[PDB]
Each structure stands twice: as structure tokens, then as C-alpha cells.
Design a protein around this ligand. Structure first.
Ligand SMILES: O=C(Nc1nccs1)c1ccc2nccnc2c1
Ligand SMILES: O=C(Nc1nccs1)c1ccc2nccnc2c1
Ligand SMILES: O=C(Nc1nccs1)c1ccc2nccnc2c1
Lengths: 177, 167, 174
């Protein structure tokens, strides 16, 4: 079926340091479609923070929404219902970094990524345990990058863009006892 | 093929990590099924100890078998024929830890897992090289009364953890 | 579709430190198939050096090609076009190690793998950026037909080809 294809798309990546790299291809056609249909939303494959961890999903508005409608690219992340939610602490409080990657060869010039970092609001409600609020609203930036800034370097290359969503590892001390 | 590909897909979800977390949902329906059919066996997805390592499988009796039939949940592990068996040392002698997990929020109370650990017996026929079942485990892993004593059954679901030691 | 089992074979292997273990079964049937069709090439599943890294593929001539046709097994590796090529440095310059494994129990006797190692030449054509420029790189005489039978290289009518790519470790400030 098509859920089988979605499953295989999800397995990149398995609980890998919270790092998802989402390639949005045919950039011009998707941008035209978004300009023709306001509030057109693209969805990344669902990805887990760690093995048996939080299930997250990144979404993008190529023509922007909210304060960025028509002028910017908008980036959001949302917690999804996961099979292991009962084994994780809530609310979700792991630091997240969005990045629009500069597709430049690292050997000829240092890339300048458009990077932003945020800490989940304990009161954002969506970062609370799934199934508590029967919003459904991702958290992020409506003005992540402007339409003019996205053409200023190698952000769009071969009609494709790269969005890197990295979730921070908590790191703790023992315990021991 | 589609059903068998679903199978292979849920096999990939595990690793290679050596840590398997097996979620058994609709606990009540399956417990009644096991009570209606003695020795009814549930099977975990096959999972590898490491990349290109031993292929293992966990099996469970929700109504118990052997000394625990009708009173306990029984947990066993068995070695399966793996594609890389000719590249591994035998007999399988890596420490194994079974856990029935307490589905409690770690931020509100520290969970109390029901854990058991064993080292593979060199003379247990199943831990020998396949072809050159015979599962090993505990018939009295947890009693029917103790499995209701905390958050072991939550939202009609149970979690069986099987952790294999690193080389 | 059937193309999905192919991708399930792929990512059952890729993410690891550039280490692909390719199991070629029914060795005898495929060997006489290659003997019946010169230059018959077997292909490993595509595998990535790291997550979002280079996409590589190993290929084999069971009856050999080039200087080893009819006498040896020939082993090659090739860079394939990957979705993240624009985020990687070129040319590919990660050291590669081929190994034919001696399928012997490591606890009763030490295996003797047939191992060869190379560092990719920066002026090699295939190691340049895919599309922005098929000649794989490798060994035509990796192992002879007689040497592949001398130990447990062929066991239970199966062979194991290990291709390991070395990872770097560059770093900066605090
Ligand atoms: O209002 C939003 N976000 C924030 N407000 C404050 C901080 S982040 C917002 C708007 C539209 C969305 N469409 C899809 C997914 N998530 C969305 C989130
Ligand atoms: O007798 C068993 N185990 C032990 N005997 C002694 C120590 S552990 C036993 C019983 C039932 C099983 N059903 C399925 C798979 N494996 C099983 C193993
Ligand atoms: O000429 C080759 N390799 C080298 N030449 C010099 C050093 S390694 C060669 C020959 C045949 C091939 N057939 C398929 C894939 N790759 C191949 C590579």
C-alpha cells in the first residue's frame, strides 16, 4: 500500500540524535502551487528523537503562513502520537534547532546556514502528552527566511532545499544509587 | 508480498541495537484468548543482537505455561537461524535481561520494572549453532495479580524489553 | 510493488560506519552463470558511508574481468548519485577496505580474511561529483578460483564481501 511507503520513509532516521534532514525537491513547482493555494502545507516524514522516543514531524509553508504569508518560508515542528508515549516524560522539553542549509561545497567555501534554536514552551499544549486536549498546532517560525533571502546564496540548488531539524540530547548525571 | 513486507518492515524497526521493546496491545482480548486456548504463544519481531549478528526472538505466554500455566506471564527467548551465523562464535553466550516495564511517567514517579537477568547456558541446545522450539526463560516471570499492582498494564498495552549485552 | 523489497534490502545495511556486508548465496550456480556469460556483474545493495552521506555500491565479477577473467574474482566499488551529494565534499576521499571473509568460528580458530585497502585517488573520475563531470575502482585479481576454495571462503554455498569506509574526525574550537 501507501502506508508501507510511509513506513519506509519514516525509517530515515531511526532514533538518531533527533536529526532529520528533509529534502524538498521541485522547489519552483511547489512554490507556484503554494502561491496558487494559500495555507498549502508540506509535511516531512515522521522521525523519532531517540530509539523508542518522541515521534515528531516538521511542516513547512513554502509561500508562508501567518505573519509570513506570501513573503517568507515558515517552519514548524509538532509532536505526534507515538507508541511509546507512556514511557517518556511530559511535557516534551528537548531543545530543537531548525536549519535551512546552504548547498555549497564545503571544500570551496564555508556554508552559511539559516539556523534558529528554541526551547519548547511547557505551556504550548502541543508539547504535552498526546491525547490530552480533545491544536494540533506546531511550534516554530512564520518568518524563518524571506523569499528574497532564500535566493541570496546556494539555499535553492538543483531546484531543491534542505531542512535540518535537530533535537538536543538531554544529558544527565546519575542516580548511581 | 505486502503482508510479508510489513513483517520485514517491523523487523527493521528494532536493530542491531540489541535492545528490543515489544509492545503488546489490546491486552484484555489477547489474555482472554490465551485463557481460552492453553499454551497460546505470542511472538516478538525477530531482532538482531548487533549489525550482522545473532538473530533472536522473544516469545510470551500471557496465560503462562509450564509451572506458571494459568497464574503467570511466561517469557522466553530463542536463537533463530540467521544469515550471518557462519560469522559468529558459538555457543551464544551473551547476557540477556528481560523486563516488564512500569508504564509510569518518569517525571512523576520512578518506575519499578520487573527485571530478570541470565547468562546463556553453554549446554542449552538452542544456544548452540542452528542446525549443527528450544526457548529459554521464565515460566513465572510475573503473577497475574502483580501485573495489576502498578502501571504495567496501561491503556490496554504491555511492554516487554529484552536487552542483550554488548561485546 | 517489487521495487519496495529492493529499498528494504538497501537500508537494512546503509547507515552503519560505511560497513556493508554483502552475502552472495548459491555460489556455484552463479559462478557457472558467470562462466556462461562473460563479464556478468553482481551488484551489492546501495549503502551510505554515513547518514545523509555518500551513496556507494560494491560490484563483483565471480568469473573475473580484465586481467582476472576466468581465473579470479574481481571486486569494485562505485559512487552513485545520492540525494545529499550537494551537502558533501568532493572528490570522495575516504579510505576503503575490501575483505573476503573466512567463514570460520572466531572462537576455535582465527579466520584469515583476504583483505585489500586503498585510498581513493583525487584524480579518479568516478570519485568526482556524480552527474557533474561507469568506471568503478577496485581489484581484478582479488582472489583466484583456487584460493577461494582453500579455506572457509565459500561455506554452505555462500560468500561474504565486506566493504568498510573509514570515517574522519575533523574538529575545531572549544
Ligand atoms: O501559531 C503558530 N505557531 C507559533 N505561534 C507562536 C510560536 S510558534 C502556527 C501557525 C500555523 C501552523 N500551521 C501548521 C503547524 N503549526 C502552525 C503553528
Ligand atoms: O521449558 C522451557 N524453558 C526452560 N526450561 C528450563 C529452564 S528455561 C520452555 C517452555 C516453553 C517454551 N515455549 C516456547 C519457547 N520456549 C519454551 C521454553
Ligand atoms: O578498470 C577498472 N578498475 C581499475 N582500474 C585501475 C585501478 S582499479 C574497472 C574495470 C571494470 C569494471 N567493471 C565494472 C565496474 N568497475 C570496473 C572497473
Amino acid at each position: 500500500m501507501l502506508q508501507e511507503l510511509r513506513r519506509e520513509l519514516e525509517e530515515l532516521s531511526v532514533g538518531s540524535d533527533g536529526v532529520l534532514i528533509w529534502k524538498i525537491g521541485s522547489y519552483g513547482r511547489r512554490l507556484q502551487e503554494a502561491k496558487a493555494k494559500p495555507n498549502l502545507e508540506c509535511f516531512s516524514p515522521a522521525f523519532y528523537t531517540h530509539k523508542y522516543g518522541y515521534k515528531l514531524q516538521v511542516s513547512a509553508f513554502l509561500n508562508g503562513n501567518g505573519s509570513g504569508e506570501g513573503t517568507h518560508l515558515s517552519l514548524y515542528i509538532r509532536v505526534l502520537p507515538g507508541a511509546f508515549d507512556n514511557l517518556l516524560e511530559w511535557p516534551f522539553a528537548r531543545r530543537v534547532t531548525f536549519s535551512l542549509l546552504d548547498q555549497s561545497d564545503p571544500g570551496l567555501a564555508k556554508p552559511q546556514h539559516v539556523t534558529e534554536t528554541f526551547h519548547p514552551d511547557p505551556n504550548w499544549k502541543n508539547f504535552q502528552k498526546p491525547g490530552t486536549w480533545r491544536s494540533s498546532l506546531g511550534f516554530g517560525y512564520p518568518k524563518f527566511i524571506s523569499h528574497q533571502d532564500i535566493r541570496k546564496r546556494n539555499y535553492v540548488r538543483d531546484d531543491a532545499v534542505f531542512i535540518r531539524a535537530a533535537v538536543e540530547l538531554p544529558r544527565l548525571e546519575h542516580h548511581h544509587h
